[model samples]
Structure formats: structure tokens, C-alpha cells
Target: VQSLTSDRMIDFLSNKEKYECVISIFHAKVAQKSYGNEKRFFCPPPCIYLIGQGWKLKKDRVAQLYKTEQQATELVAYIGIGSDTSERQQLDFPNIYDYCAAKTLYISDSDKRKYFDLNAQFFYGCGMEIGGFVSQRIKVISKPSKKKQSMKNTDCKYLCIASGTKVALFNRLRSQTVSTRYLHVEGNAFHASSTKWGAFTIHLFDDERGLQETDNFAVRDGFVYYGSVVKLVDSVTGIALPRLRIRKVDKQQVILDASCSEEPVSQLHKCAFQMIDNELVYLCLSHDKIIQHQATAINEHRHQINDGAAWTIISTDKAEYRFFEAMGQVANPISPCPVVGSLEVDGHGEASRVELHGRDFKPNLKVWFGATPVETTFRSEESLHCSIPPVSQVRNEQTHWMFTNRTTGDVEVPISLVRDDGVVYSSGLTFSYKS
Candidate 1:
């Protein structure tokens, strides 16, 4: 990792030194297999395909989550990219996916929004690990139809896709490497892997596999490539890429250390920016020919946020992170809402107490250092004083404290606030710790 200053990253991307190849979704509709008599069509996971500059994404590219309406499950690929790089709330679907494209959503000029359209949602960005550089997510809603709700259209908030079993949105099995939430096989699980370009290891799916070995995962002359068929998609898809994270998600953001800071820093607002492993994490700044990133950090500081830029940082906490800020990110918590802006100092190695800066502080506000309650002294509506528990005195699991003992030399813990009336406010900001 190099001491990469914000200016360095900005220069790197501004010059298009490593612009993303612009990826899109390649939905692979699977065919049914035999059940001794009843044929069952298994909906294979949506694979990824590359789209170079010459191509344009349709505002409405229709694909059925189910082979038929009854099986449709009303699942829609909920895409949320309008002038916003998207937020935990803006990108209206489950925040889970493969590699993400670290870009600000840009489109609709005069667009007053100044927003850069990040290919926020996609099926895959590259052939890498369990997750690809995917951008979008799926949602379930009802559409006007002859059978559904008497044919009256009632769609809002989300883009309707699957109407399958309602309670099954997320897979509790994060213990496993790949996401099996969308892999709904009829009889048995679709045993897939990316090393084989999403080709199923089970041999039974050979009929739907991508035939060309070269197509399994190819990228030449800066153009993206994919297999003839998606059933061939393994967790690794076809195009082989150096693995990375979109969040703590896949650890795919193209990163470097402060050692790599081609520039400097100022009034910094450290955030847990989600990483989009496939593409560059902060802006369109990736390695010349590599796919994954090396460091996990971005720099959308005071200067950049107001000036229209973003930053990113990656770690293994697995929370909805906020690494960078784009040209025009619309929302942030207001006063009275109790927001955790940033620690006056990023961390403290020996200090037993730390000061917090944010909005709307009440005398009655309760402070939670991770999941544990800590003694708090309200200084003002914008600042609060909280006690930091010593490492040996507290149980790591009981609080947000994670004893990483990392080779990197630091760990992060979260601090949130609550009121007596149960008014809660937390921007998901994390505090640093150094042993």
C-alpha cells in the first residue's frame, strides 16, 4: 500500500487513468430439469456481462424473476440511481450483492442534481469471487394484471420482481462465502463457483454451462467479456479478476494506504463507506489491468464533499458503510434527530475519554459505545463527552469492541445515541481504536 493522498486519487481518476469498463446485468434464464415426471425450471442466479461505452442501458429492461406470472413472485430488480450515488435508503433494495461499481450516478444533464449515475445496481461487474461487481438488488411488488389485484397497478417505492415466499429476503448463512439468497433451485441447490466462470461444479448443470473456456472470464484491450451462457456462471463468473470488496461486502474497492495518498487531508469526516470491489471504490480509479483493490479507504473530506467528490475506506465490520460522498448526496440527519458526525480525533490509544461531534444533543441522550451503555456528559447540542472502556476491563463481544489484533494496527467500534423517550439517532459512524 502507498501513502495515497486524496489529491493523488483524484488525479488518478480525473485523468481517467483507470476508468471502469462500465458493466451491466446479463440475466440468465434457466431451463427446467426432470423430476422423474414433473419438469422443474430452476431460476439460476442472474449473471453479469460487460457493456463498453458505445452501448446504452435501457430505462426499462424487462426480465421475469419467474418463468410465469404465478411463479413470478413479483420480484423486480429494484434499481435506485437518479442523480444520487445512492444511500442505504436511496438504493431501495436489500444492500447485499457481489462486487459493486464505486461510481456516482451521473445522467440527465441540466439535471441540476449534478449527480453522477453510478451503475449502482448490476448482476456482475467481473468474474472474481462469490460476488461479482454487481450494482443492483431485487424487490417484490405487485403489478396490474388480469389475475393479480383485479388488474389494478399499485407500484411504488420498489421495483417489483419476485413474489416468492415472502419471508425469504436474506440468507442467514453469511457463514458461507457466496450469497445463496437468490439461488433458488427446485430440487437441489445449484452448486456453482466463479473459478469456473459460474459453471456449476455439479456437472448436472453442464447443459446450461458457458462452453468457451476463454469466455469463462476474459478481458482484453480494455473491453469486458462473458460466456455464451450464464448458467455457466459460478460464484467466480467467467472473467477472472483479482478479488476485492464492495463493502466489507467483498473487500473489492481499489484502495491504497495513506502511504499512497497522492495528496493531503483536512477537516476529515471518516465514514464506513461501502466498498464496490470490482470497480474503483471511491471514483472511477482502478488499477490499469487488475480487478480487485489493495487498500480499503476513500477521502471525501470537508473540501471534497462540499466541492463534489467522495472517499472510501474498507474493513471487516460488515456494516452499512459510508466511505465517500459524491457530487450531490441529498441527505444527512438533522438536529433533534441526534446524529453522530465524527470523533474530534479519529482515535485514542491511551486516553480514557473521547469527545463526539454531531447535531441535536439532549441532556437526556443515552450514549451507546457499540451495544453497551457508557457514561455520557452532554457538552452542548453539537458535542458530547463519553467514556472509553479499557480493553481488559470490558468483554469484546459484550460491546461493539472487536479485538482484531490486526496486522494493520487499528480496529473500529461504533458509537450511537438514544433518548429517554426512545428517540434514536446514529449515522452508523465508527470510532477508531489502536492497541
Candidate 2:
């Protein structure tokens, strides 16, 4: 799952201490809203923001500092981008989210590649940090140039659409399988990956055949429920991997979903899409069940956004781009404030399968047990896994006949990692229950 192209995400995120810097916004148009019959599916759907490590977003130019000066006013993190920029498209030259309240910046490159430009009052009042957003400053220019440099919110989050080149710089994989189920007309969705699947039109327009192995395809996207970047099963090989994938359009088969991200689709849910009589169903709620889908014939459907960056774009018949170099391999990962550090306990007690080192561990990093919420798994940005239950339901107590000799200890408790969007990283770190 290694594919990146933001000029090597700075020599592999400068070796790393704890990081997962992603920016994958693939947009090729998806604006269908209805108010009465309720067909609300508003384009941008992924969220996770913050940045500081590798920073560099400037535009003071009075030679320096002055947005309102607190060191040049910075809040940085956007999605929804209103202030409306009027119909935008294109990533190689311009069309960055139609340009309304834009908030990005790019530098010129030579052979070392690093030319990603954007600036509009340093992106006026935008919020979320999406459609590929966030990042305040960092002018690390050192490549045969004595160039002085320095930098670290390192979240830089989500968005999805399939035929995109407007924001390309990706590598968020964990998919260890995808040999092709074939169906990516421009990300109408469906490609399946493993031996590094390919043929992603938008910028490497295939048709003469010689190259169609673009790392990992079949990664659909578009606000896949909050805390979602794109994961429908595959919290570390749980398999299934469906991001509402659809694109066969001929007769009919309909799988809908295998396990909708483990029916674990609720980090808190309420995704929508309804047309009722006109037939466009696809709604979701979470109490345990309720999902709807509509597709008997769909060819003109639009959506194929992995928001993993590396920019994909294919203008149907001609017009190309497909860049990935999340290359050199440290590849594919996740994020958001989670700083543990160590709790390794391998085997012994009501259970034994733990490991939750630290540093911004995301992709649904939940592993609690003082407030109950275990079953964690997401192995990057330092590592995480979970198991260790039965303490009579986490201390509600009463599971047996104990005539102890003096003691039967080992039950420390106090653990937590709950972060769908940063907050509870309980640094008290305990978890030792094995008696």
C-alpha cells in the first residue's frame, strides 16, 4: 500500500517519530441536493485536521507578517469551502475546488519535485481541513541548497471524487488484496487491489496497454461517515473493503455491502442519499441496522475519490495525469492526536493481545477499559491492537468462586485511546489485568 507524490512527503516524513500526513481529495463533480424528498449527498465527506511539523504557508509579502499578526493570523483547516468560487476543475494548472476561499500554497520544483501552489489571503476563513486542507507553515527547502529550515498538528485530512488531479499527494493503504474486479471508468468505483491494481484514468489514460498497475485502486470515497477517510472493512485485514462501491451497470447483481466497515459504520452515523420514486436510495443510520441502496442501472454515476492523494485525473477519452511516489516505500497510513508510547503486554490473563505504542495513531483508534470500548486495531503511526476483556464486564464484577490464599492480583485498568477526532488519549496508561 505504498503510493505517494508530495515530493516524497519530505524524505519519508523525515524518518518519523510519530506521523501520518495525508491529503487525498479527488473531485470530478458530485453535487446533487434536494430538500423535500431528501436527496442530500453533499460532496465533501472526510474530516481530520491540524498541522505543525512540516509547515510552510505564507503570504504576508509586505515582506513578512501581517494577516492580523499573531505571527500572521493562523487557524488553518478547511472543508466545505464556501465564498463560492464558481465551477472549478483541473489540478495540473488550476481548478482547485473552484477557487472560492482557497487556502493552499505550492513551491516550484526542478527534478526534485515540489510545486504545489495556492494562496488567497492564505485561504480566507475556511474550516475543517479538507478536500485536502490544513497546514500553516514550513519552508523546508534543502536539496543542494544550504537552505535553513524548521517545523510539526500533522493531521491534514479528507475528501473524495474519482477523476481528480486538483489535489494529488497520496498513500493511505492497508489493502493487501485487490487483483481486479474491474470497474473504474473514472472511479464510478470498483477495481479491487492486491498485486498492485491499475488502469486509473484521469491522467495516464490507458489504451495501448503497457501500464495499468497503479499500486492500489478500488478505493472509493466521499464522506464515508464521520471518522472516515475510506474504510469499509480492513481495519488491518478484516477484509471486505467497500466504500459504497458500485459500477457494473448492465443487468443486475447488487451486493450493496459485505459488512459496511464491519457494521461498525458508526463512529456516529447518519449518511444520506434518497430519491425514493426516482430511485436513488442509499441511506444509513446506526443503532445496529438500517441501510438502503438503489442501482439497477447506473453508468453515469460519478464518484471515485480515495482522498489518499497522488492525484488521479482522466478526461474520459483524452487528458491525463496519475502521479504516485508515496514511493521509496514506508507507504500507506493514518492519523490525529493519539500519544500513548508503551503498554506492550503480550500474554497472560482474561486475555493477552495488546500493543499500543504511540504518536497520533488513527483509523479509529479506540481502546478503552475504564469506560469500556475495546476491540482496537490499526497498525501505523506507531502501532495499536487490542484484546483483554472479561474482568466481569470491565469491573462490574462477580465471575466466580474465590477462596484466595492472600492475593490473585494483576488488574490495573486506567486505559484509553478513543479518538475519532482527537481528545481522549488518557496518558495514565494502565491495562494489566491477567490474574
Candidate 3:
């Protein structure tokens, strides 16, 4: 529909009491194994995982690997965690199958049934499911700072999903529409793990340029990996088409493998790749159709293929990192509390200066001596320089100074690195005047 950039997120999230958040869901099949020649696989059913508010993850973190399907719908679709009534109506779209990620903006009320809307890609299936994921939410604390706000390039990360012939990058924090796309380079299996290599070497386009050549570019240690490819028909159209085969390869060897055949590929009815316990694991759909219970586990067995057998072991492992390096490094979500290490005073009169050493200070940061606001300059992310009022302007009494983010409205909050509570102020720093 429309784009959901950081600017738009501010409008919805600026009001902390009326908080809004995004939710992403992924679909995969549970795996099982069998020894039958033709029926060597058991049934695999679709399982889902949720990452966002109302789940096990902290409220600020967007990406996670856990199980919470029903709680997810309940949190976003029904009532919020703290509120008694529903804040907004849960919006749903079908038909966009294969994979999906969504950003939802809702008020934190139970009786309200309306939410802000934005534009995104079209979907056709009854629901949404996406693999090779990424996500982020705009952190807007106030309206005054919203107009001149600039999200630090360091605060932004991208979620990339590649399939068929395109690789799409979406802002993980903003949870916006596809910010860029690369064409022609078809994708198959994608594994998200730790960054073995230090950087990525892929070109992305905000607009359509001519397609680039498919050079020897296959897998990057920190980039999206499109395993292999196959040819299939539209069954409905009887036309040949290019399909990304679900397989994993490393230079000259096949680590874990699967192919689309007349029969099921593995114990799971669906095929997908995941990084579990530092290993590349494949969830294959089995041939059994009558199994009712859907489950998954790691087992070591000699997988027999057409050529021969390969001893395969499936265990979980840390995932490769997924942020682009050239555009400044991005970090995880920042805490709402302002970090202050020390303070110093210099000069006198109108030239009086006070340097507040701290971290997470922004351009919109405001300094206060007691209740009086003072002009402040953003020296750096770790520092804030302020001009104190002249002797004539000061009241003849001892007072304290504090800091608050005009954008996030965080005032005197705790010293946390990953949470937000609106309008938090810093702990009072004693100020003495004797002239």
C-alpha cells in the first residue's frame, strides 16, 4: 500500500501511553525421519513463531527465534498486554504466501478498534509467512522533536528476503515496505547466522536500474545465501518457470540437501532451512500423509540419496550476522534512560558553559537547571554541552540540573540500555551558586 518509514512511525508511537508495535510471523514444517524407500519421510505440518510485544522477547527487540503463535495474535489482534480492552482492530490479509513480514501500529487501549495504516506489498494467500527475516520499529517519543528528527544511520538495520529472482531489503526497525531490491539474482535457501566474514558485497537499488549480471556471486558470510535452483511449471498455466530449490552447498560439497519430487522430500510436508546450534539444518517434509501430531527434533542418520549416502548431523548453532556494513554500523535498540557519567562547569556570565558528559544524547535533548530550560548543544552521542544562564538570570538558591530527550520524552529514568518509558528525566545533579 504505502510506505511505513521512521517518520510515519513517530506519529503513532510518539505517545507512550498509546504505544504501537510490529509483529512478524514465520511458517515452517516439523521434521521426522523414516527408512522406507519411497516413503522415507514422515508428515511435516506448518509451525509458526512470533517476535514482538506480548511474547517472550523484550518489548524493544524485534527479531527472535521462539514459539508463541496464539499469544502473538492475542497481543496484536486482540487486547494488549497492559490494557484491558483492545487498542485497535487486528488487520489481516491473505494470499501473500511463500513468506511474509508485517508492521502493525495500534493504540494501547482495549475499547478502541482503530489503528494507523500504511502501504506494503500485496498478499494473496489466506495468511502471511516469510523466511530469511529482518525487522525494526520507529522509536518516536514526542511530537515536538518529530519534525526535525533524523534517525541515526547507526539505529537502522535491514531484514532481507530473497527468492525467485529478487532480493528485497526492509528496514527492520521501521518495519516499512521494501526499501530496495536487486533483480535477476535468483534466491533459494537463506540461512541467518553469525557473520563469519566481516562484510557483504551486494548491490541494492532503491529504484529499478537495468539487471546486473549473475557473476560468481553466490554466498557471502554476512549476506543472504540462495542455495540452488530448479525448473518447474505453473501447473495451472503449463508454462516452465524458475524455482529456487531448497538445498545447501559449500563450494564443492552438499551439506544438507532436498529436491522437489513426486513424493514428499522429508518428514515435514514443507521444506525450509534454519541455522540451529551452529549448523545448517534442513527441515524436510516426509511422505506420510495420515500423521496427526506435528513435531520436530535433531537426529543424525545416513541420508541415502540417488548417488549414495552422506552422514548428516542436525544441531542448533548461532546465526550469521545480517546488517550491511558500508552504511555506518547499526546497533541494537537503545535504552530510554540518558547515560550521564560526569559534569563540568566553565566561564561565567553570559559566556558561562556547562559540559555534561553522557551517552545517547540527541540533537533534541533539552537540559534543565531545576525547572528552567537551558540552551543545549549536542556535542556528540557521548556528550552534551550547555550554556548556563548569567548570574543576574539565576535565582539566589541552590538547585539541581537534569536532562530529557525532547524526542523520546525520557526524563529521570533508570540506567538501562534497551527499554523506553516516555518523558523520563535524569537524576538531579546538584548545582550551587555563590557570587
- By TM-score, rank the candidates, best first: 1, 2, 3
Better of 1 and 3 by TM-score: 1
Task: Give the candidate number with the greatest lDDT.
Answer: 2
TM-scores for all candidates: the values are 0.24, 0.23, 0.21
Q: What is the lDDT of residue 385 in candidate 1?
A: 83
The residue-by-residue lDDT of candidate 3 on 241-291, one tens digit each, is: 223233332222333422221121221111233323323333221221111
Q: How should the candidates be ordered by lDDT, best one leading?
A: 2, 1, 3
- For model 1, what is the alpha-carbon lDDT of residue 167? 11
List candidate 1 stretches off by more than 4 Å. Answer: 1-335, 345-352, 396-411, 421-424
> In candidate 1, how many Å is residue 303 off?
37
Could you tell me how far off, in angstroms, the CA of residue 51 lies in candidate 3 after the best superposition?
Answer: 14
Candidate 2 lDDT over 81-124, as tens digits, reads 22223312222211122222111222222223222212111221
Q: Report the error of model 3 at residue 288, Å.
A: 17
Instruction: Count the clashes in each prediction.
Output: 78, 43, 51
